[PDB]
């Protein structure tokens, strides 16, 4: 579902970037969660295939 | 006992956070004091 994925990614973008600068805490948490659930990267960035 | 273990691990983490620093700031001191008061109450509970 790329369409819904884009909406959730937009919310995460607004959560991690504030006033032209990256919020380090939120950025690190988001990166850790994304790598712990690799399916969030879409089929293209799947490790194996 | 389980809660006491969790609190002890949190306090150890706080100590490791502040170990390098020469002096603990006021905010860290206040958090340490709150944790120590809670631990005091838990120790009293186990004693009773």
């Amino acid at each position: 579902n790329p369409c819904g994925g884009e909406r959730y990614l937009d919310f995460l973008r607004f959560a991690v970037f504030v006033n032209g600068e990256s919020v380090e805490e939120n950025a690190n948490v988001v990166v850790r969660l994304l790598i712990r659930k690799p399916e969030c990267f879409g089929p293209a960035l799947r490790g194996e295939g | 006992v389980d809660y006491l273990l969790r609190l002890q691990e949190s306090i150890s983490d706080f100590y490791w956070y502040y170990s390098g620093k020469d002096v603990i700031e006021e905010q860290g001191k206040r958090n340490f004091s709150k944790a120590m008061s809670v631990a005091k109450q838990v120790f009293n509970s186990l004693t009773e």
Binding site: E6, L9, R13, S22, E24, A27, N28, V31, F41, G42 | -
Partner: protein
């Protein structure tokens, strides 16, 4: 939709990327996060897109 999802994902990761002042200070967390992001997204793919 697929292109937009991947663009949003890349935007989110780029915004999660650490700040230059942190990188210069050499913070281990910042360096680790940047290494993770670089491993996730190759430079050649960005240039090709």
């Amino acid at each position: 939709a697929i292109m937009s999802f991947y663009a949003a994902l890349i935007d989110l990761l780029g915004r999660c990327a650490p700040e230059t002042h942190l990188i210069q200070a050499g913070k281990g967390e910042a360096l680790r996060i940047r290494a993770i992001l670089r491993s996730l997204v190759p430079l050649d793919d960005l240039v090709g897109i």
